[PDB]
Short mmCIF file of C-alpha atoms and ligand atoms in Angstrom, two decimals:
data_model
loop_
_atom_site.label_atom_id
_atom_site.label_comp_id
_atom_site.label_asym_id
_atom_site.label_seq_id
_atom_site.Cartn_x
_atom_site.Cartn_y
_atom_site.Cartn_z
CA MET A 2 36.70 17.34 -8.32
CA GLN A 3 34.59 14.25 -9.30
CA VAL A 4 32.41 12.47 -6.70
CA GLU A 5 33.31 8.90 -7.61
CA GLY A 6 30.65 6.19 -7.02
CA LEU A 7 27.61 8.47 -6.53
CA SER A 8 24.51 8.60 -8.77
CA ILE A 9 21.40 10.75 -8.28
CA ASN A 10 18.01 9.27 -9.08
CA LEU A 11 16.25 12.37 -10.37
CA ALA A 12 13.20 11.71 -8.23
CA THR A 13 15.36 13.20 -5.47
CA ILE A 14 14.96 16.69 -6.99
CA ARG A 15 11.83 16.04 -9.04
CA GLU A 16 9.81 19.00 -7.73
CA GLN A 17 12.66 21.46 -8.35
CA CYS A 18 14.14 20.37 -11.65
CA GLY A 19 13.31 18.95 -14.99
CA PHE A 20 15.87 16.76 -16.74
CA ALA A 21 18.30 19.36 -18.08
CA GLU A 22 18.48 21.39 -14.87
CA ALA A 23 18.82 18.25 -12.78
CA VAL A 24 21.77 17.17 -14.91
CA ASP A 25 23.30 20.69 -14.68
CA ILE A 26 23.18 20.73 -10.85
CA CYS A 27 24.51 17.19 -10.63
CA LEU A 28 27.48 18.14 -12.89
CA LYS A 29 28.05 21.37 -10.84
CA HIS A 30 28.67 18.99 -7.88
CA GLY A 31 30.95 16.55 -9.70
CA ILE A 32 28.21 13.93 -10.18
CA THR A 33 28.35 12.09 -13.53
CA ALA A 34 25.75 9.39 -12.99
CA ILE A 35 21.97 9.78 -12.85
CA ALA A 36 18.80 7.71 -12.94
CA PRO A 37 16.02 9.59 -14.68
CA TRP A 38 12.38 8.67 -14.92
CA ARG A 39 10.48 8.06 -18.13
CA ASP A 40 8.13 11.03 -17.60
CA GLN A 41 11.12 13.35 -17.17
CA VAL A 42 12.70 12.00 -20.36
CA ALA A 43 9.39 12.37 -22.22
CA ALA A 44 8.95 15.99 -21.04
CA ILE A 45 12.34 17.04 -22.56
CA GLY A 46 12.22 14.50 -25.40
CA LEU A 47 14.15 11.25 -25.71
CA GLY A 48 16.44 12.60 -28.42
CA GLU A 49 17.47 15.65 -26.42
CA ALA A 50 17.88 13.57 -23.31
CA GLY A 51 20.28 11.20 -25.11
CA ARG A 52 22.18 14.13 -26.64
CA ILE A 53 22.73 15.56 -23.12
CA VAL A 54 23.76 12.14 -21.86
CA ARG A 55 26.30 11.60 -24.65
CA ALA A 56 27.61 15.24 -24.59
CA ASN A 57 28.35 15.09 -20.87
CA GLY A 58 29.48 11.45 -20.79
CA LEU A 59 26.75 10.59 -18.19
CA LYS A 60 26.29 7.09 -16.81
CA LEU A 61 22.69 6.05 -16.18
CA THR A 62 22.59 3.68 -13.21
CA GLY A 63 18.99 2.96 -14.22
CA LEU A 64 15.92 4.15 -16.10
CA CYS A 65 12.80 4.28 -13.91
CA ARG A 66 10.72 2.29 -14.72
CA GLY A 67 9.12 -0.64 -16.44
CA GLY A 68 6.99 -3.34 -14.84
CA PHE A 69 3.32 -3.09 -13.96
CA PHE A 70 2.54 -6.49 -15.40
CA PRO A 71 -0.61 -7.87 -13.75
CA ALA A 72 -3.95 -7.06 -15.37
CA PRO A 73 -7.34 -8.72 -15.40
CA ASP A 74 -7.21 -9.76 -19.05
CA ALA A 75 -4.80 -10.76 -21.80
CA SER A 76 -5.19 -7.47 -23.64
CA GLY A 77 -4.21 -5.55 -20.56
CA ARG A 78 -1.29 -7.80 -19.78
CA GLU A 79 0.01 -7.46 -23.35
CA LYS A 80 -0.46 -3.66 -23.20
CA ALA A 81 1.84 -3.66 -20.16
CA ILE A 82 4.39 -5.98 -21.82
CA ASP A 83 4.43 -3.78 -24.90
CA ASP A 84 5.00 -0.65 -22.76
CA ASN A 85 7.99 -2.41 -21.26
CA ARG A 86 9.38 -2.91 -24.78
CA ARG A 87 9.13 0.87 -25.25
CA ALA A 88 10.87 1.33 -21.90
CA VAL A 89 13.67 -0.96 -23.10
CA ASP A 90 14.00 1.11 -26.28
CA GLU A 91 14.27 4.28 -24.16
CA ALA A 92 16.87 2.69 -21.88
CA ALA A 93 18.90 1.56 -24.90
CA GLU A 94 18.84 5.06 -26.43
CA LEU A 95 20.09 6.55 -23.16
CA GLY A 96 22.73 3.84 -22.57
CA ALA A 97 21.16 2.93 -19.24
CA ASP A 98 22.96 0.28 -17.16
CA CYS A 99 19.56 -1.31 -16.50
CA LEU A 100 15.82 -0.83 -16.78
CA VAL A 101 14.32 -0.92 -13.31
CA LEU A 102 11.15 -3.04 -13.05
CA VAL A 103 8.45 -2.20 -10.49
CA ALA A 104 6.34 -5.35 -10.74
CA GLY A 105 2.77 -4.07 -10.41
CA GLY A 106 0.22 -4.93 -7.76
CA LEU A 107 -2.89 -7.09 -7.89
CA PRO A 108 -5.11 -6.85 -10.96
CA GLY A 109 -8.16 -4.79 -10.09
CA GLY A 110 -10.63 -6.70 -7.90
CA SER A 111 -8.40 -9.71 -7.46
CA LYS A 112 -7.18 -11.27 -4.22
CA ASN A 113 -5.06 -13.80 -6.06
CA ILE A 114 -1.56 -12.66 -5.08
CA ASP A 115 0.06 -15.85 -6.34
CA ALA A 116 -1.54 -15.37 -9.77
CA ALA A 117 -0.40 -11.74 -9.85
CA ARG A 118 3.13 -12.98 -9.19
CA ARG A 119 2.85 -15.56 -11.98
CA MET A 120 1.81 -12.68 -14.32
CA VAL A 121 4.99 -10.84 -13.27
CA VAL A 122 7.17 -13.81 -14.14
CA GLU A 123 5.37 -14.32 -17.46
CA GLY A 124 5.55 -10.61 -18.24
CA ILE A 125 9.32 -10.42 -17.59
CA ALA A 126 9.76 -13.52 -19.71
CA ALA A 127 7.82 -11.84 -22.54
CA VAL A 128 9.99 -8.70 -22.38
CA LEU A 129 13.35 -10.45 -21.98
CA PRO A 130 14.03 -11.24 -25.66
CA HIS A 131 13.49 -7.58 -26.51
CA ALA A 132 15.73 -6.49 -23.66
CA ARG A 133 18.48 -8.98 -24.54
CA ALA A 134 18.42 -7.91 -28.22
CA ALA A 135 18.69 -4.25 -27.11
CA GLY A 136 21.52 -4.90 -24.66
CA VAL A 137 19.40 -3.65 -21.72
CA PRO A 138 19.68 -5.62 -18.42
CA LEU A 139 16.34 -5.92 -16.64
CA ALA A 140 16.59 -5.14 -12.92
CA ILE A 141 13.76 -6.54 -10.82
CA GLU A 142 13.41 -4.18 -7.87
CA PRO A 143 11.85 -5.95 -4.88
CA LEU A 144 9.63 -3.32 -3.27
CA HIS A 145 8.79 -2.81 0.36
CA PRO A 146 6.01 -5.16 1.44
CA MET A 147 3.71 -2.17 2.12
CA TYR A 148 3.51 -1.76 -1.67
CA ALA A 149 2.42 -5.37 -2.36
CA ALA A 150 -1.24 -4.79 -3.14
CA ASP A 151 -1.14 -1.82 -5.43
CA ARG A 152 2.38 -1.13 -6.73
CA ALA A 153 4.63 -4.24 -6.74
CA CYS A 154 4.01 -7.79 -5.68
CA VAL A 155 7.73 -8.72 -5.81
CA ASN A 156 8.48 -7.96 -2.17
CA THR A 157 11.65 -9.77 -1.03
CA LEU A 158 15.12 -10.02 -2.49
CA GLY A 159 14.85 -13.82 -2.16
CA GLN A 160 11.71 -13.85 -4.26
CA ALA A 161 13.29 -11.51 -6.84
CA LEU A 162 16.26 -13.84 -7.08
CA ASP A 163 13.95 -16.87 -7.42
CA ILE A 164 12.46 -15.18 -10.46
CA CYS A 165 15.97 -14.40 -11.85
CA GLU A 166 16.85 -18.07 -11.51
CA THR A 167 13.64 -19.15 -13.29
CA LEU A 168 14.03 -16.75 -16.20
CA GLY A 169 17.72 -16.95 -16.78
CA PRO A 170 20.19 -14.58 -18.38
CA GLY A 171 19.48 -10.86 -18.83
CA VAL A 172 17.59 -10.32 -15.63
CA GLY A 173 19.02 -9.27 -12.28
CA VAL A 174 18.07 -7.20 -9.25
CA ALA A 175 18.08 -3.60 -8.06
CA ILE A 176 18.73 -3.50 -4.32
CA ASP A 177 17.07 -0.42 -2.79
CA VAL A 178 17.75 -0.14 0.93
CA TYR A 179 14.31 1.36 1.50
CA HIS A 180 12.62 -1.77 0.24
CA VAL A 181 14.91 -4.44 1.73
CA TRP A 182 16.70 -3.13 4.86
CA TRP A 183 14.24 -4.89 7.23
CA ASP A 184 14.53 -8.34 5.69
CA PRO A 185 15.80 -10.80 8.31
CA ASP A 186 17.45 -12.86 5.58
CA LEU A 187 19.07 -9.85 3.82
CA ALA A 188 22.69 -10.89 4.39
CA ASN A 189 22.22 -14.36 2.89
CA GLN A 190 20.20 -12.99 -0.05
CA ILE A 191 22.81 -10.31 -0.88
CA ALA A 192 25.48 -13.05 -0.85
CA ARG A 193 23.20 -15.21 -3.03
CA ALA A 194 22.69 -12.32 -5.49
CA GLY A 195 26.47 -11.97 -5.76
CA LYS A 196 26.93 -15.69 -6.50
CA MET A 197 24.30 -15.37 -9.23
CA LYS A 198 26.11 -12.26 -10.63
CA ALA A 199 22.63 -10.69 -10.43
CA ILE A 200 23.27 -7.31 -8.69
CA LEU A 201 22.59 -4.51 -11.18
CA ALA A 202 21.92 -1.48 -8.98
CA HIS A 203 22.10 -0.22 -5.41
CA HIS A 204 19.72 2.52 -4.32
CA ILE A 205 20.31 4.55 -1.17
CA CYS A 206 18.20 6.70 1.17
CA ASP A 207 17.05 6.09 4.72
CA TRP A 208 14.17 4.80 6.82
CA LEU A 209 12.99 7.51 9.21
CA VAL A 210 11.65 7.06 12.73
CA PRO A 211 8.81 7.89 12.56
CA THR A 212 7.95 7.42 8.92
CA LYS A 213 5.18 9.89 8.17
CA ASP A 214 3.88 8.71 4.80
CA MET A 215 4.01 5.38 2.98
CA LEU A 216 5.41 6.85 -0.22
CA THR A 217 6.88 10.33 0.12
CA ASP A 218 8.82 10.31 3.40
CA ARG A 219 12.06 8.57 2.53
CA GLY A 220 15.01 9.91 4.53
CA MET A 221 18.25 11.47 3.54
CA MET A 222 21.03 9.00 4.28
CA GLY A 223 21.99 9.26 7.95
CA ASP A 224 18.72 10.81 9.11
CA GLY A 225 17.22 7.34 9.66
CA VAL A 226 18.06 3.88 11.00
CA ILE A 227 19.39 1.84 8.09
CA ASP A 228 22.85 0.35 8.47
CA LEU A 229 23.84 1.79 5.07
CA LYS A 230 27.53 1.08 5.68
CA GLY A 231 26.82 -2.57 6.48
CA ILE A 232 24.56 -3.17 3.50
CA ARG A 233 27.13 -1.54 1.13
CA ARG A 234 29.95 -3.65 2.58
CA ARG A 235 27.90 -6.75 1.91
CA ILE A 236 27.04 -5.61 -1.64
CA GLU A 237 30.76 -4.94 -2.36
CA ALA A 238 31.70 -8.35 -0.84
CA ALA A 239 29.12 -9.89 -3.17
CA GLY A 240 30.99 -8.36 -6.14
CA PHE A 241 29.01 -5.23 -7.00
CA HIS A 242 31.09 -2.03 -7.04
CA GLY A 243 28.75 0.22 -9.06
CA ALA A 244 27.59 3.63 -8.02
CA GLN A 245 25.18 4.14 -5.17
CA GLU A 246 22.04 5.80 -6.50
CA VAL A 247 20.32 8.33 -4.23
CA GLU A 248 16.59 7.94 -4.49
CA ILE A 249 14.63 10.10 -2.06
CA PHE A 250 10.90 10.88 -2.18
CA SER A 251 10.35 13.61 0.47
CA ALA A 252 7.23 15.70 0.02
CA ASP A 253 7.60 17.79 3.20
CA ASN A 254 11.39 18.16 3.39
CA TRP A 255 13.90 17.61 0.54
CA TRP A 256 11.45 18.34 -2.29
CA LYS A 257 10.77 21.75 -0.65
CA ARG A 258 14.45 22.73 -0.49
CA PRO A 259 16.72 24.27 -3.18
CA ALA A 260 17.99 21.52 -5.49
CA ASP A 261 21.49 22.82 -4.92
CA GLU A 262 21.29 22.25 -1.19
CA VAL A 263 19.70 18.81 -1.68
CA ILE A 264 22.52 17.58 -3.94
CA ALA A 265 25.19 19.15 -1.73
CA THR A 266 23.64 17.27 1.23
CA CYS A 267 23.55 14.02 -0.80
CA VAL A 268 27.27 14.33 -1.46
CA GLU A 269 28.07 15.08 2.21
CA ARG A 270 25.90 12.22 3.49
CA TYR A 271 27.29 9.88 0.84
CA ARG A 272 30.77 10.73 2.10
CA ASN A 273 29.88 10.25 5.80
CA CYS A 274 27.00 7.87 6.16
CA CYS A 275 27.25 5.25 3.41
CA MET B 2 -27.64 -18.22 18.67
CA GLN B 3 -23.83 -18.51 19.25
CA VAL B 4 -21.34 -17.33 16.58
CA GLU B 5 -18.96 -20.27 16.75
CA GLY B 6 -15.26 -19.61 15.92
CA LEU B 7 -15.30 -15.78 16.13
CA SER B 8 -13.35 -13.66 18.64
CA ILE B 9 -13.23 -9.85 18.83
CA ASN B 10 -9.95 -8.15 19.66
CA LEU B 11 -11.25 -5.19 21.65
CA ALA B 12 -9.09 -2.76 19.71
CA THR B 13 -11.83 -3.12 17.09
CA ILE B 14 -14.22 -1.05 19.24
CA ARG B 15 -11.65 0.68 21.42
CA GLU B 16 -12.91 4.24 20.86
CA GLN B 17 -16.52 3.29 21.65
CA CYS B 18 -16.24 0.87 24.55
CA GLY B 19 -14.30 0.10 27.64
CA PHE B 20 -13.93 -3.52 28.72
CA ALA B 21 -17.33 -4.19 30.28
CA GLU B 22 -19.36 -2.58 27.49
CA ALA B 23 -17.25 -4.29 24.84
CA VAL B 24 -17.96 -7.64 26.46
CA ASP B 25 -21.69 -6.78 26.73
CA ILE B 26 -22.01 -5.97 23.00
CA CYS B 27 -20.01 -9.03 22.02
CA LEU B 28 -22.33 -11.25 24.13
CA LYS B 29 -25.43 -9.47 22.66
CA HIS B 30 -24.18 -10.80 19.28
CA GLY B 31 -23.44 -14.35 20.41
CA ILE B 32 -19.67 -13.78 20.65
CA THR B 33 -17.98 -15.56 23.58
CA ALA B 34 -14.32 -14.95 22.80
CA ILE B 35 -12.39 -11.69 23.08
CA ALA B 36 -8.84 -10.39 23.08
CA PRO B 37 -8.50 -7.40 25.38
CA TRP B 38 -5.57 -5.08 25.78
CA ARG B 39 -3.66 -4.51 29.00
CA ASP B 40 -4.66 -0.83 29.22
CA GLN B 41 -8.33 -1.79 28.95
CA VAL B 42 -7.92 -4.40 31.68
CA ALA B 43 -6.06 -1.89 33.88
CA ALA B 44 -8.78 0.76 33.42
CA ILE B 45 -11.51 -1.61 34.80
CA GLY B 46 -9.15 -3.50 37.12
CA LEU B 47 -7.69 -6.97 36.66
CA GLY B 48 -9.89 -8.50 39.34
CA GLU B 49 -13.12 -7.19 37.85
CA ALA B 50 -11.99 -8.15 34.39
CA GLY B 51 -11.38 -11.76 35.50
CA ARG B 52 -14.71 -11.87 37.35
CA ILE B 53 -16.50 -10.83 34.12
CA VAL B 54 -14.51 -13.39 32.17
CA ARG B 55 -15.34 -16.24 34.56
CA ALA B 56 -19.03 -15.17 35.04
CA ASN B 57 -19.69 -15.17 31.31
CA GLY B 58 -17.48 -18.16 30.47
CA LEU B 59 -15.41 -16.00 28.02
CA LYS B 60 -12.47 -17.41 26.07
CA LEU B 61 -9.55 -15.03 25.59
CA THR B 62 -7.87 -15.77 22.26
CA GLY B 63 -5.05 -13.51 23.45
CA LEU B 64 -3.99 -10.73 25.79
CA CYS B 65 -2.43 -7.77 23.96
CA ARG B 66 0.48 -7.41 24.57
CA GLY B 67 3.93 -8.14 25.88
CA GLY B 68 7.20 -7.72 24.01
CA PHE B 69 9.13 -4.49 23.53
CA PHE B 70 12.43 -6.10 24.40
CA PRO B 71 15.26 -4.10 22.82
CA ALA B 72 16.76 -1.26 24.86
CA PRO B 73 20.12 0.48 24.89
CA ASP B 74 21.20 -0.90 28.26
CA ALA B 75 20.80 -3.89 30.55
CA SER B 76 18.59 -2.02 32.99
CA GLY B 77 16.20 -1.13 30.24
CA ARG B 78 16.16 -4.61 28.80
CA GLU B 79 15.44 -6.09 32.23
CA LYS B 80 12.68 -3.50 32.82
CA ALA B 81 11.03 -4.78 29.64
CA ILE B 82 11.50 -8.44 30.61
CA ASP B 83 10.01 -7.77 34.02
CA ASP B 84 6.98 -6.03 32.44
CA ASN B 85 6.45 -9.15 30.38
CA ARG B 86 6.34 -11.18 33.60
CA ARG B 87 3.53 -8.88 34.77
CA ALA B 88 1.81 -9.39 31.42
CA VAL B 89 2.07 -13.16 31.92
CA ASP B 90 0.51 -12.81 35.38
CA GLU B 91 -2.36 -10.80 33.85
CA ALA B 92 -2.86 -13.38 31.10
CA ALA B 93 -2.90 -16.20 33.66
CA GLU B 94 -5.51 -14.40 35.80
CA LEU B 95 -7.74 -13.94 32.76
CA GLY B 96 -7.22 -17.50 31.45
CA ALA B 97 -5.86 -16.17 28.16
CA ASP B 98 -5.02 -18.75 25.48
CA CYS B 99 -1.78 -16.85 24.86
CA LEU B 100 0.10 -13.64 25.56
CA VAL B 101 0.75 -11.87 22.28
CA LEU B 102 4.31 -10.53 21.93
CA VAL B 103 5.02 -7.42 19.83
CA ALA B 104 8.81 -7.61 19.69
CA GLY B 105 9.90 -3.98 19.93
CA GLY B 106 11.88 -1.96 17.41
CA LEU B 107 15.46 -0.76 17.43
CA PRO B 108 16.89 0.59 20.69
CA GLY B 109 16.99 4.36 20.49
CA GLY B 110 19.79 5.63 18.23
CA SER B 111 20.81 2.20 17.04
CA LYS B 112 21.02 0.91 13.48
CA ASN B 113 21.94 -2.57 14.62
CA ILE B 114 18.84 -4.52 13.55
CA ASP B 115 20.53 -7.88 14.05
CA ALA B 116 21.42 -6.96 17.65
CA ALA B 117 17.85 -5.79 18.28
CA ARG B 118 16.66 -9.18 17.08
CA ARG B 119 19.15 -10.97 19.37
CA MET B 120 17.69 -8.90 22.28
CA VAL B 121 14.23 -10.17 21.30
CA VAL B 122 15.36 -13.78 21.40
CA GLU B 123 17.15 -13.25 24.73
CA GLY B 124 14.16 -11.39 26.15
CA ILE B 125 11.70 -14.16 25.20
CA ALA B 126 14.09 -16.69 26.68
CA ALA B 127 14.18 -14.69 29.93
CA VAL B 128 10.36 -14.58 30.14
CA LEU B 129 9.71 -18.19 29.12
CA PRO B 130 10.26 -19.85 32.52
CA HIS B 131 7.76 -17.46 34.07
CA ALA B 132 5.29 -18.10 31.27
CA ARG B 133 5.70 -21.89 31.42
CA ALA B 134 5.22 -21.89 35.23
CA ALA B 135 2.04 -19.79 34.79
CA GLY B 136 0.65 -21.97 32.01
CA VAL B 137 0.65 -19.02 29.55
CA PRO B 138 1.75 -19.78 25.93
CA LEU B 139 3.82 -16.98 24.45
CA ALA B 140 2.71 -16.04 20.93
CA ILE B 141 5.33 -14.22 18.87
CA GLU B 142 3.38 -12.04 16.45
CA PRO B 143 5.45 -11.28 13.34
CA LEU B 144 4.55 -7.70 12.45
CA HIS B 145 4.31 -6.07 9.07
CA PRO B 146 7.74 -5.02 7.84
CA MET B 147 6.68 -1.35 7.93
CA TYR B 148 6.82 -1.64 11.73
CA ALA B 149 10.40 -2.98 11.85
CA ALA B 150 12.21 0.12 13.05
CA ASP B 151 10.00 1.35 15.82
CA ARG B 152 7.46 -1.30 16.90
CA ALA B 153 8.59 -4.88 16.13
CA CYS B 154 11.69 -6.25 14.51
CA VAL B 155 10.21 -9.77 14.12
CA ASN B 156 8.83 -9.27 10.63
CA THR B 157 8.27 -12.62 8.90
CA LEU B 158 6.51 -15.80 9.96
CA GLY B 159 9.67 -17.72 8.97
CA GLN B 160 11.77 -15.62 11.30
CA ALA B 161 9.20 -15.99 14.11
CA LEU B 162 9.29 -19.75 13.65
CA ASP B 163 13.12 -19.72 13.64
CA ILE B 164 12.95 -18.11 17.06
CA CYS B 165 10.35 -20.70 18.25
CA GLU B 166 12.72 -23.46 17.17
CA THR B 167 15.66 -21.86 19.01
CA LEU B 168 13.79 -21.32 22.25
CA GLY B 169 11.79 -24.48 22.45
CA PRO B 170 8.57 -25.36 24.22
CA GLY B 171 6.07 -22.73 25.41
CA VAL B 172 6.49 -20.33 22.54
CA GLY B 173 4.48 -20.25 19.32
CA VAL B 174 3.13 -17.74 16.82
CA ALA B 175 0.15 -15.46 16.31
CA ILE B 176 -0.66 -15.23 12.61
CA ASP B 177 -2.26 -11.86 11.82
CA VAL B 178 -3.23 -11.56 8.17
CA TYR B 179 -2.42 -7.85 8.20
CA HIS B 180 1.20 -8.54 9.02
CA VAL B 181 1.82 -11.64 6.87
CA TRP B 182 -0.59 -11.74 3.87
CA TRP B 183 2.07 -10.36 1.46
CA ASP B 184 4.78 -12.87 2.31
CA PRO B 185 5.74 -14.82 -0.82
CA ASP B 186 6.64 -17.82 1.33
CA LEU B 187 3.44 -17.69 3.45
CA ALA B 188 2.05 -21.07 2.37
CA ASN B 189 5.22 -22.97 3.25
CA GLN B 190 5.62 -21.11 6.56
CA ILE B 191 2.00 -21.79 7.62
CA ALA B 192 2.57 -25.50 6.85
CA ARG B 193 5.85 -25.32 8.80
CA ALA B 194 4.09 -23.69 11.78
CA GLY B 195 1.57 -26.54 11.76
CA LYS B 196 4.32 -29.20 11.77
CA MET B 197 5.89 -27.42 14.74
CA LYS B 198 2.47 -27.31 16.51
CA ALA B 199 3.28 -23.61 16.92
CA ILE B 200 0.04 -21.85 15.78
CA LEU B 201 -1.54 -20.14 18.78
CA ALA B 202 -3.75 -17.46 17.25
CA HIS B 203 -5.19 -16.22 13.96
CA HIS B 204 -6.05 -12.55 13.61
CA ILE B 205 -8.30 -11.27 10.84
CA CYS B 206 -8.97 -7.92 9.14
CA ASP B 207 -8.12 -6.71 5.65
CA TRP B 208 -5.56 -4.78 3.63
CA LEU B 209 -7.23 -1.84 1.89
CA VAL B 210 -6.40 -0.40 -1.51
CA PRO B 211 -5.34 2.31 -0.93
CA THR B 212 -4.11 2.06 2.62
CA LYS B 213 -4.36 5.56 4.07
CA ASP B 214 -2.33 5.30 7.26
CA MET B 215 0.42 2.94 8.43
CA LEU B 216 -1.30 2.08 11.70
CA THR B 217 -4.98 2.99 11.87
CA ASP B 218 -6.43 2.04 8.47
CA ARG B 219 -6.90 -1.71 8.71
CA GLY B 220 -9.92 -2.92 6.73
CA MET B 221 -13.01 -4.77 7.69
CA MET B 222 -12.77 -8.28 6.26
CA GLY B 223 -13.90 -8.22 2.62
CA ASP B 224 -13.28 -4.52 2.07
CA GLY B 225 -9.67 -5.23 1.03
CA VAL B 226 -7.54 -7.65 -0.98
CA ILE B 227 -6.45 -10.41 1.37
CA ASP B 228 -7.37 -13.96 0.41
CA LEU B 229 -8.80 -14.53 3.91
CA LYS B 230 -10.49 -17.77 2.85
CA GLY B 231 -7.24 -19.17 1.46
CA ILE B 232 -5.14 -18.26 4.48
CA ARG B 233 -7.75 -19.79 6.85
CA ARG B 234 -7.90 -22.99 4.79
CA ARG B 235 -4.14 -23.28 5.07
CA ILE B 236 -4.21 -22.58 8.83
CA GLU B 237 -6.90 -25.28 9.32
CA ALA B 238 -4.89 -27.72 7.13
CA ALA B 239 -1.91 -26.98 9.36
CA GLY B 240 -3.97 -28.13 12.38
CA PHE B 241 -5.20 -24.90 13.97
CA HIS B 242 -8.99 -24.72 14.40
CA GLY B 243 -9.19 -21.93 17.01
CA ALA B 244 -11.30 -18.84 16.72
CA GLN B 245 -10.53 -16.11 14.24
CA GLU B 246 -9.84 -12.89 16.13
CA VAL B 247 -11.04 -9.65 14.52
CA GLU B 248 -8.47 -6.95 15.06
CA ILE B 249 -9.24 -3.70 13.25
CA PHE B 250 -7.61 -0.31 13.85
CA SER B 251 -9.71 2.19 11.80
CA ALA B 252 -9.46 5.80 12.91
CA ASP B 253 -11.63 7.28 10.14
CA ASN B 254 -14.21 4.52 9.67
CA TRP B 255 -15.01 1.69 12.14
CA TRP B 256 -13.87 3.55 15.26
CA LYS B 257 -16.32 6.36 14.34
CA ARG B 258 -19.33 4.02 14.03
CA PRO B 259 -21.66 2.62 16.73
CA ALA B 260 -20.02 -0.41 18.38
CA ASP B 261 -23.20 -2.33 17.74
CA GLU B 262 -22.97 -1.82 14.00
CA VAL B 263 -19.23 -2.64 14.00
CA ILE B 264 -19.74 -6.00 15.73
CA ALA B 265 -22.79 -6.82 13.60
CA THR B 266 -20.64 -6.14 10.50
CA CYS B 267 -17.81 -8.30 11.91
CA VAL B 268 -20.23 -11.21 12.27
CA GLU B 269 -21.64 -10.74 8.74
CA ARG B 270 -18.18 -10.44 7.17
CA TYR B 271 -16.91 -13.37 9.21
CA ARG B 272 -19.78 -15.43 7.80
CA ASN B 273 -19.22 -14.32 4.18
CA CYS B 274 -15.63 -13.34 3.66
CA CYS B 275 -13.44 -15.55 5.86
ZN1 ZN C 1 14.56 2.31 -5.94
ZN1 ZN C 2 -2.64 -8.85 15.63
#
């Protein structure tokens, strides 16, 4: 009956379903773990979202997302930090296993990528006490390098782990195959993450050939070229046995299909291709 | 009169100009270094291209390109290796400072990215004796990670340098800001390249915000977010003082403008923004 070890990031059916319907279809397929987004939670209301979570015994593999730290001035940086505190409060209410952090790109006008990265480290450090007090692990999600300028300037698992080592307890990593599959040093950095006890989440999807859009053409698992099986074996060998979270952005395919069929296909591909 | 230290990769005006006209406009602006592509050379003829090169005293900062090593079988891999030998012969005829190598993506159907990378190393090793005998340095060009699956599975300068160390003399790197600007370890790897005496080329352009296409929306220098000045200072500190090669693929902007204006703008932006 239950599909053990599978979570659905609700972006996967974001065009078709708001929060309650997404949960309903996931439960209809034996799925008891989700990762909602803050806008989806806000649209239903945080209190109702947590009631649904607690009533159905749902695990949250993550809440998406905090981050977005760099800004051209102190006021803007603190506005971002303070938003992350709200995100932590939301995650805590929902019992999320972590708050996913998407670092933010360059401050407007700036070319100073190293400074942007320092603002990320400082921003995480500013949020950490709030997160630790709330019992909410912070998961730095290294993002594909194509996102460096304008979405997230933490772009390798090695770099993410360097930040985890600098900041100390309460911060780990979310390993999303879309963002990291290409990294020539991926095997060593997964092993490193495991030694650090830093792995908080594992997101799955695929890299299509060709990829037709930089943001909204993620593949269903098995439709692309990622060695999903190999990555998962390495993550398990590193000591992480949590659910695999399906996170697909697909403007011209999966978002245009009935949510039922999408989730059915996620379960099939999870069984066969992961 | 002369614009010292500037080269134009002829992709920059590829829609507007074949080889002879491209050279003419570059010389009209005081530019005496180019990097043509093999298709452009073939369209005019290798003999005529070399005559033009020798008559005008042109430097070639590169010939684009060899590579494309991985294939599902030995016959296909050897076909690729043998093409690279032809590319070396072309580079030698034109007096090119290097042959740029774009590694190739995964063999069709395969998910085995590590094996693809082994085929790259083996392929370069197979070509090297031909290149060394011809006097043609091979320049491994790490490519942006977004190209990993289907164009080039050498995706970081560190990885490129690892291959250079494995293979030994006659192989170095082409450092293209588009492909490497995001790398969190870029400063250390540029310094490393310099210690290895491995830097063979420096390609310039910019990363736009937003980037509107994965292949054909490179920016004119200064229109994007790359710290061009900083990268160049590090390349010079590492011991490379060769020309900066402008390589812009811009389907909706620079390729639609008069070649004259494009090259004029390259010289202005080279002066101000590099
Ligand atoms: Zn993710
Ligand atoms: Zn290049």
